[PDB]
Structure formats: structure tokens, C-alpha cells
Design a protein around this nucleic acid. Structure first.
Ligand SMILES: [Mg+2]
Ligand SMILES: [Mg+2]
Ligand SMILES: [Mg+2]
Ligand SMILES: [Mg+2]
Ligand SMILES: [Mg+2]
Ligand SMILES: [Mg+2]
Ligand SMILES: [Mg+2]
Ligand SMILES: [Mg+2]
Ligand SMILES: [Mg+2]
Ligand SMILES: [Mg+2]
Ligand SMILES: [Mg+2]
Ligand SMILES: [Mg+2]
Ligand SMILES: [Mg+2]
Ligand SMILES: [Mg+2]
Ligand SMILES: [Mg+2]
Ligand SMILES: [Mg+2]
Ligand SMILES: [Mg+2]
Ligand SMILES: [Mg+2]
Ligand SMILES: [Mg+2]
Ligand SMILES: [Mg+2]
Ligand SMILES: [Mg+2]
Ligand SMILES: [Mg+2]
Ligand SMILES: [Mg+2]
Ligand SMILES: [Mg+2]
Ligand SMILES: [Mg+2]
Ligand SMILES: [Mg+2]
Ligand SMILES: [Mg+2]
Ligand SMILES: [Mg+2]
Ligand SMILES: [Mg+2]
Ligand SMILES: [Mg+2]
Lengths: 78, 178, 141, 98
RNA sequence: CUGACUGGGGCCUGUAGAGCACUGAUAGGGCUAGGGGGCCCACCAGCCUACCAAACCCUGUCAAACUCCGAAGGGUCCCAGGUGGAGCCUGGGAGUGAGGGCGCGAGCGAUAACGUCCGCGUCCGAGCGCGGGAACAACCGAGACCGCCAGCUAAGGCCCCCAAGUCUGGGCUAAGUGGUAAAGGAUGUGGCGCGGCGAAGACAGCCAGGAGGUUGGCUUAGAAGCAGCCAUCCUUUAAAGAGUGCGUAAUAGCUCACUGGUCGAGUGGCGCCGCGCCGAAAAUGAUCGGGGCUUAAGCCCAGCGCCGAAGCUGCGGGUCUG
RNA sequence: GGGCGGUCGCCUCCUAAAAGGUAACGGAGGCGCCCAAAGGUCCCCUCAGGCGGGACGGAAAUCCGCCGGAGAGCGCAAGG
RNA sequence: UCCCCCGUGCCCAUAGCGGCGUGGAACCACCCGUUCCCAUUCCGAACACGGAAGUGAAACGCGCCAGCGCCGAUGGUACUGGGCGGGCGACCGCCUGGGAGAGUAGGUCGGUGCGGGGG
């Protein structure tokens, strides 16, 4: 007659942290993702927990186009 | 048959459908022209003039359009039509759903079922000249166990047959005993 | 009564009752239909009480059609119990219905007998349920 | 539907493509995400020698001197359908160095 | 000049909605791995299953923990507007960490609570200062610096307490509905559309031979139209069934569905729609604030005015900031 | 309301209102570990099922061919 | 300044699936062997090597077929920021913008780069 189950985990708080059209530095996390919802393009590196970040600085761009997954492209400025 | 038409130029029409003037649109290959028809004329002819009959539509340009219905959107807690999609037929074997029916003793009338699966006789495409008004299906002896239709004896006179399937057709169900 | 034999989870929520119909206005099975007009719930006791009131009314012919299925567990706490301490027990599965949805559809019953039978089963439900016949208002092209 | 796809990684952005047919071979050098073939050296387009595995030395010197003639050094090497065995086209000029 | 907010461009989501292709449940119909099994046969040499039923395909569905789909919105970044008790950085100084109401999106509850707990916003708290709602913090308007025997308005009203129309029109309600709530019911009225009939005479009326095979057939006593069965008739006629309700144990009988006239110009079934009636019985004295109100002093669509705050302007005076 | 009962930390899904967060004695479940390979690099292959068969074989052991684009598997509950 | 074929791409099922053609002078594939460099929990099937006497059957390209699959228009609501009201409640109505998912018409069995071979 008691409460069977009333606990819940603390949120790890994932999500897209840098959208496109944003000037970034070398090292900014583009997206905190649980699984690899985004695939690395140019100048994009993954880590341990599928987190991809920028290798250089510039204006970032998404969706080169599909059929393999969503793309992240850190494009440098010239 | 013999229904009037008008024009629409991107109006309000939720405010126009208060006096029994529901909107519409007709086409055969192009010219998606927005019209509105009258509700007691369209409803009164639409009492018996079903999908099989070619409802013709007088237009202020002087043309008589051989149309039919594509869908009647039910008002869904009011039981009314919002918008009816007309379909002009052209020189093309267009698609038709003909409400055929059943005549005869169903299953030996005392030991009879229901024969409720009408389902609008799934599809028959036709030229505009060989289009029918009524095709008859008999139910000569079809008692409870055997003798089902199975669309094998579904050869209509002429044009055309059912295209892909032969599976949806009426059958005999047992009654509700106490 | 009747109940779903398998579920993913036992208890679930209530929600709201808005929306028009989400399907279920065209009859497509029988020649008549008992269509609802007010949003409420349909218990399995309301299903049984309306289903018995057909087969006991008309006999030897006419198949009855039901197009309602209870998948929502009505959750009620026991009597003289304070608030909290989890949800209550499950007593009977209810069925959410929307206005303008056709619930009961008679088959093989005539006009003056189907109006009467749907009139008898109309009083077994807490909803204003009017009666519609077979019209040309199908979804065919 | 056989494919190995060692051409999918592309960390180095400049590769030398190799195709080995059962008659002879031919090779290209592609620039990635642009779609422009810079230089190539093809057997039976220059018809160097009959034996198919003796091609790799002369097309290695030929594609090497045409690569240095076009002024590209930092290149790479694909292994899409084929093992690094048999023909090698080994070179000592250009940054492939294998 | 970056800020709240807004405009022009991208990016993101998986909620509302919708859907079954995925995860499960499912109302039927067809096909039938097979199984109590087999009509029962040298067992495979079957046959229909009115026996059950796997899996598959259609007509149909449901989902916070399902998404092939998928907005309105929100967030973020670039440019522009935005000089505002706007923002940004540092330091000093408190208070708060019992909240509550309302509308929406929700959970628990019982789709109960002026009930509990979140989010989006407002208000009270801290504006119990003001006007309306009779009185009342969160329902509406409005953000009170002070003063004037000045106007215009917001919400709400214009029969009197109570300041302003017994205003001008078109209908509606006979219940004090207004001024207390549901399922259901009823020639209550007013409006729209369909059908039949009709002055080759229509409805309710008053008179009529209101019938012959035929008590059709063991119907278990009894089946004459009338407890309940078959497969449902025909012919005599200027109109009549295997009968509309009684009445009989069954009879008999009374009324008929169907129709002939001397009459008389309209007559029934409906499907919506506005306001109504019953359902509606609690405990000190009753009432919509009260008196009263019926071509209204209620209800629906309008129009011209007026009353109406501490709101705004007319004027004077003080303070604070630039 | 307190006591009795249940819970005290971490993870997964929903509630949770399409950025992030978000409560209840709200619903459904797991954990206090394990792998010298169940790690790194390099090189080969594509799964689970269904159909047609087999010599045993439950309708699942092992083998062949076709269909099968991810319904399998990824140490462990759930999600990606 | 063009057609055919081979590599390598970008569009992300309008590119595939299934059926019907067609091609080897020219590439490519098939084939004949394994003798060595190589390999197989086993085998030259797949990697590797000599070839190349025979072939386009299979696979591979091009062309056709809309049903199989996919994409999918104008209206019309569902829904909803925002504002205004109704119902005792469950929940609805109007205006202003925005605007789906199914379904219907229809479309398709490809479009477009770079470098080579032959005419
Ligand atoms: Mg493949
Ligand atoms: Mg590989
Ligand atoms: Mg290979
Ligand atoms: Mg600015
Ligand atoms: Mg900003
Ligand atoms: Mg904006
Ligand atoms: Mg959802
Ligand atoms: Mg939903
Ligand atoms: Mg947007
Ligand atoms: Mg401030
Ligand atoms: Mg505290
Ligand atoms: Mg607190
Ligand atoms: Mg709170
Ligand atoms: Mg409270
Ligand atoms: Mg409440
Ligand atoms: Mg305040
Ligand atoms: Mg007070
Ligand atoms: Mg007041
Ligand atoms: Mg106040
Ligand atoms: Mg002030
Ligand atoms: Mg005034
Ligand atoms: Mg006065
Ligand atoms: Mg009342
Ligand atoms: Mg008047
Ligand atoms: Mg002021
Ligand atoms: Mg002044
Ligand atoms: Mg979220
Ligand atoms: Mg949100
Ligand atoms: Mg590993
Ligand atoms: Mg209720």
C-alpha cells in the first residue's frame, strides 16, 4: 500500500549548443548529443560520448545533405 | 446532374457557407478553378445521385462540366459538408466507384445472414462512353458455411475489371441468437 | 464484460477531451448508426448494458456492430483512503469517445425496428447520441 | 553489393585513386569536395607495357613525374576494392612515399 | 546603444494535430502452420467443418512512456529600429526562500473541491487607494504628487432609491422564464426547407352489404385475424387481410387498416432553429440589491445621445532626474 | 497532520506544455558491477527471420539457394 | 563541337524494386589455369598472379513498361500564437494572422559536375 516507484534521474542536459551562422572559436562544442544524431563534416571532431566539436574557427553550417545522417560543417573564414 | 456553378477568388468562405453555399474545386488535368455550389441543390441531387452518376455542372461561361465527387468532408459533430472536391472527366479512362447491389434470396431467407459488406465495389476504371449506371450482383444460394463470392465471379460487362485486387467482397455472417 | 488481454503498461493518464472526432464518422459497416454528440467516457458496463439491450430486443436476425474498444484504465482509490500514496487500483477499462463519432451500428434491422432499438440503447449512455442512417456521405471517390 | 569503402574517412583531403581492371590498371588524383581531377596516368591511354603487374613501376615513375610536373606533393592513396599486394607502384618523389 | 521588445534571414525540436510503416491492444471479413479432431478410410487414398486456431491480406480503430509525418510557437546567432528608473562590470547594503487567486497547457484526485504540485502570464501580497459587479484581494476598467462648486471617457447603466432615454426601429417571450442545474418527456409558441393530398370535392367527421376459399394446417387441451409456428396467399368487388385495438378458455361480437356521398378550401409526417413548461423537496423571514416590470423596466440584431474613476486633458503649486 | 508502512545516492523513458530546466507518498524499470580482452591499429564478412529441401531433426542444432536495408546483435534495465 | 563506355562525384527513393529489350571491334565483366610474390578455422569462389584461346548467358550500362514502391500540387478544415465571449461543469463560438498530417489529381523508373578511351 506504499509508493512503488517515485525516483527519477538528474538530467545530463544535452542539446544543440551552437547553431549555424554563429562565429565560434577552436574548441566550441557544436552539439551535446546522446547518440550520433549529427555526423562530422569538415573540421569537426568527435569525442568519447559522441560529442563533436570544432577544429578551427569560423562560420558553421549544417546539412550538406542527407542519406547518411545529419552533417555539421565548421567552415573557416577567408 | 444539372447543377449551377459560380466563381471564387480567394474569399472568406467560412463566412460564405452560412446560407448554404459550400465551396468546391474541379479539374480533369489542369485549371484548378475554385467554385461554390448550393447546399440544398447539391444535397437534394446528392440524395440519390451517388458516386456512379456523372453530375454535370453548368458554368457562367456556358460549358456543361461532366464532374463527379472525390471527397465529402464530414463536419464531424455537425454532420455537414465543408468542401466537396469535384472531378471533371476528360477523354481518359477515369476511375469510378459504382455502388452495385445484391438481389435475390440471401442465404435461404429464413436461414439468412446480413450481407452488409457493400464497401462501394472497390474500383472500376472506364472510358466516358461505356460508363454504367447500374450493375447487378445476385445472391443465388449462398448459405452460411460455403458459397462465398471471393471476387472470382467478378467479370463485369465490358470496361473495366478490378485492376489489382480480388480480395474485398461481401460474405455471409451468422445471426445473433439469444 | 470485456477487457484488453495484454498491455505495455498497466496505468495511464486522463488527458483532455478536445478535438472533433479523429476518425469514425462514416458508418461503412451497417445501414444505421448511433452517433454521439458530447465528450465523455464509455465504461465496459456501458458497453455490456447497451449490447445486451440489442440482442434481448430484436431476435433471430440482425448482426450488431460495435466500434468502441476500452483501452483506458479507470483508476480509483479505495474508500476512506487519504490523498497521495500512489495511484488507485484499476476497476474497469473505459473508452474515450469524441462528438460526432459513430459507436453502435445495427445490421439487418429495418427502419421502424432499428429506430426503436437504437432508441432503447441510446438511454443506456450518458451522452446525447443522435441516430443517423445510411446516407451518401461516404468517403469514396 | 560488395564494397569495403576505405574512401570514407578522408582525413588528409587529397587522395590518389586506383582502379585495377583484369586487363590493366589506371589511376587518378582527386581533390575532395570540389570534383576536379587534377592529373592522371592511364595504361592503354599511353600503352606502356603488356604485362599488367609490370605496369606499376612505369606508371609510378610516370604518374610521379606528372604529379611533380603539376606541382602537387602532399597526396594520399586509396584501397577501395583491392589489397595492398601484387602491384605496388612504389615511388620516392611526392609525399606518398610508399 | 549593447538592453526588454520588434522587423528581415538561417538553424534546432518531436508537443498539438494526424497516421499505422515501427512497438503493443484491437470490431469484423477472406485465406487456413496445425491442433479435441477427423463422416471415419488397406491412413494418408479424401470430404465439409455449421469445431478451435497460428501466420498473412483488406474494411475499421487507440495510445503519456509508438512515430512513416508534422505546424502554430519558443530559443539561439547576423543586421536595423529601440536614450529607457533600458542594459553591462566592480564594490557596499539589506529583505525573501508558508504564498494565494484567475485563464491555458498538465499530473494526483472522482474531468470533485475557495483541494495538492509544476510551467506559461496577470493581479493581490506590497495598490483593503478609486469606479462597476448590492456588499467581497486577485471578475472588468484603472495604475491615487497636491488643490479647484471645470470638461471628455474606460468597464457598467439610462422607471425610482441612484447620476443618466419610460429613446428610435424589427421580432420574440405569457413562464415572473428573466431572477436556481441535468438525463428524459410533451398539438407551448414563432421562423426556414421537403413530401403526399386538393375545389377530376382534400382531413377530422355522420351513415354503409365492412367480405368468399378460410376454424388454411397434429398447431398438446384451442387457435375462427388477434399466446407462440409455415412462406405469406388468391378470387369475387363500387373498397377490404391469413387482419388495427379490444373482448372471448376458444367461440360469438365491437371497431377496422382499404372506400361511396349531401358538405368544405385547405389538410398530415417531418428535419433544423429562438424563447419557453415539467423534471426542481431542507430545516430563524421571504425576495432578482429592493420596490416594482408583460407591443417591457426581460431576450436577439441595430442606431443616436447621455450618466459614469483619484484615467486623460483646463489651470495653479511642490519635489526628483536629464 | 503525526505515528505504522515506503523512500533518502546514480542512470533510462514519460509526465515535461517541439531550445535547456521543471514538482508530487506520479507511472515503468535497473546499479553499488564487469573485460588481458568484451581494448588500440590493420585486414576480411554482413544480421535476425520466411520460403524450397535434409539423415537423423521439437515447428529452433548443422548445410545450400532466393527474398530480406536493418524487425538481429552491440556484457547488463530503458533510450539514442 | 557531339554520341558510347570506364573511373570519380554532388543531388538523397521523382535515383530503388520487378518484368521486357539490347551491347562487346571499344573499354568492363565473364572465362582458362596456378608455375612462383600471395591464401583459404577449407576450398583461386573473394582477395593474388600468368594470361586471354571462347563469351555478354550472369553481373554491369543504356532504353521501355506506373503497378509494386516513392514524391506529391489549389482549396477545405483539424490545430494554434494574440484578442473578444459562452457554458454549473465536461468543453465550445467569433475576429486577426499562420498553417498542417492523411486523401485526391498528377509526376518519375533519373538530373547535373570533372578526368580518360573510340568514332
Ligand atoms: Mg548493397
Ligand atoms: Mg571494411
Ligand atoms: Mg574488394
Ligand atoms: Mg542593435
Ligand atoms: Mg537580444
Ligand atoms: Mg521576430
Ligand atoms: Mg506524440
Ligand atoms: Mg493526440
Ligand atoms: Mg520557425
Ligand atoms: Mg528597475
Ligand atoms: Mg524553506
Ligand atoms: Mg517553498
Ligand atoms: Mg507554488
Ligand atoms: Mg491554493
Ligand atoms: Mg481547482
Ligand atoms: Mg502590484
Ligand atoms: Mg475591507
Ligand atoms: Mg463595488
Ligand atoms: Mg483592489
Ligand atoms: Mg501616478
Ligand atoms: Mg459625456
Ligand atoms: Mg433620473
Ligand atoms: Mg432552469
Ligand atoms: Mg420593440
Ligand atoms: Mg495622472
Ligand atoms: Mg501641471
Ligand atoms: Mg524538453
Ligand atoms: Mg517548452
Ligand atoms: Mg571494441
Ligand atoms: Mg460531469
Amino acid at each position: 500500500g506504499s509508493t512503488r516507484n517515485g525516483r527519477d534521474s538528474q538530467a545530463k542536459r544535452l542539446g544543440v549548443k551552437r547553431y549555424e551562422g554563429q562565429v565560434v572559436r577552436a574548441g566550441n562544442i557544436l552539439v551535446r548529443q546522446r547518440g550520433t544524431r549529427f555526423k562530422p563534416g569538415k573540421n569537426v571532431g568527435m569525442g568519447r560520448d559522441f560529442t563533436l566539436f570544432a577544429l578551427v574557427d569560423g562560420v558553421v553550417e549544417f546539412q550538406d545533405r542527407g542519406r547518411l545522417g545529419r552533417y555539421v560543417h565548421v567552415r573557416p573564414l577567408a | 446532374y444539372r447543377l449551377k456553378a459560380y466563381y471564387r477568388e480567394g474569399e472568406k468562405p467560412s463566412a460564405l457557407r452560412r446560407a448554404g453555399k459550400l465551396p468546391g474545386v474541379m479539374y480533369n488535368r489542369h485549371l484548378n478553378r475554385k467554385v461554390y455550389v448550393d447546399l440544398v441543390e447539391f444535397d437534394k441531387v446528392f440524395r440519390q445521385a451517388s458516386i456512379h452518376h456523372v453530375i454535370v455542372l453548368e458554368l457562367p461561361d456556358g460549358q456543361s462540366l461532366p464532374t463527379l465527387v472525390r471527397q465529402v468532408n464530414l463536419d464531424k459533430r455537425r454532420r455537414r459538408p465543408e468542401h466537396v472536391d469535384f472531378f471533371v472527366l476528360s477523354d481518359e479512362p477515369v476511375e469510378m466507384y459504382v455502388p452495385l447491389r445484391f438481389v435475390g434470396t440471401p442465404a435461404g431467407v429464413r436461414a439468412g445472414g446480413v450481407l452488409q459488406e457493400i464497401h462501394r465495389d472497390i474500383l472500376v476504371k472506364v472510358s466516358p462512353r461505356n460508363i454504367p449506371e447500374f450493375i447487378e450482383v445476385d445472391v443465388s444460394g449462398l448459405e452460411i458455411g460455403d458459397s462465398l463470392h471471393a471476387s472470382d465471379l467478378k467479370l463485369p460487362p465490358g470496361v473495366e475489371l478490378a485492376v489489382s485486387p480480388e480480395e474485398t467482397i461481401a460474405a455471409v455472417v451468422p445471426p445473433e441468437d439469444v | 464484460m470485456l477487457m484488453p488481454r495484454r498491455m505495455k503498461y498497466r496505468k495511464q493518464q486522463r488527458g483532455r477531451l478536445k478535438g472533433a472526432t479523429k476518425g469514425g464518422d462514416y458508418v461503412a459497416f451497417g445501414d444505421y448508426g448511433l452517433v454521439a454528440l458530447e465528450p465523455a467516457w464509455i465504461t465496459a458496463q456501458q458497453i455490456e448494458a447497451a449490447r445486451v439491450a440489442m440482442v434481448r430486443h430484436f431476435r433471430r436476425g440482425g448482426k450488431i456492430f460495435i466500434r468502441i474498444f476500452p483501452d483506458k484504465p479507470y483508476t480509483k482509490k479505495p474508500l476512506e483512503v487519504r490523498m497521495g500514496k500512489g495511484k488507485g487500483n484499476v476497476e474497469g477499462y473505459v473508452a474515450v469517445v469524441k462528438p460526432g463519432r459513430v459507436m453502435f451500428e445495427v445490421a439487418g434491422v429495418t427502419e421502424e425496428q432499428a429506430m426503436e432499438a437504437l432508441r432503447i440503447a441510446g438511454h443506456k449512455l450518458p451522452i446525447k447520441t443522435k441516430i443517423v442512417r445510411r446516407d451518401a456521405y461516404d468517403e469514396a471517390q | 553489393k560488395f564494397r569495403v569503402r576505405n574512401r570514407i574517412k578522408r582525413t588528409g583531403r587529397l587522395r590518389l585513386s586506383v582502379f585495377r581492371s583484369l586487363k590493366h590498371i589506371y589511376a587518378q588524383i582527386i581533390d575532395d569536395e570540389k570534383g576536379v581531377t587534377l592529373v592522371s596516368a592511364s595504361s592503354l591511354a599511353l600503352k606502356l607495357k603488356g604485362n599488367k603487374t609490370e605496369v606499376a613501376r612505369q606508371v609510378g615513375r610516370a604518374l610521379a613525374e606528372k604529379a611533380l610536373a603539376l606541382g602537387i606533393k602532399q597526396v594520399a592513396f586509396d584501397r577501395g576494392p583491392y589489397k595492398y599486394h601484387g602491384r605496388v607502384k612504389a615511388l620516392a618523389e611526392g609525399a606518398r612515399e610508399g
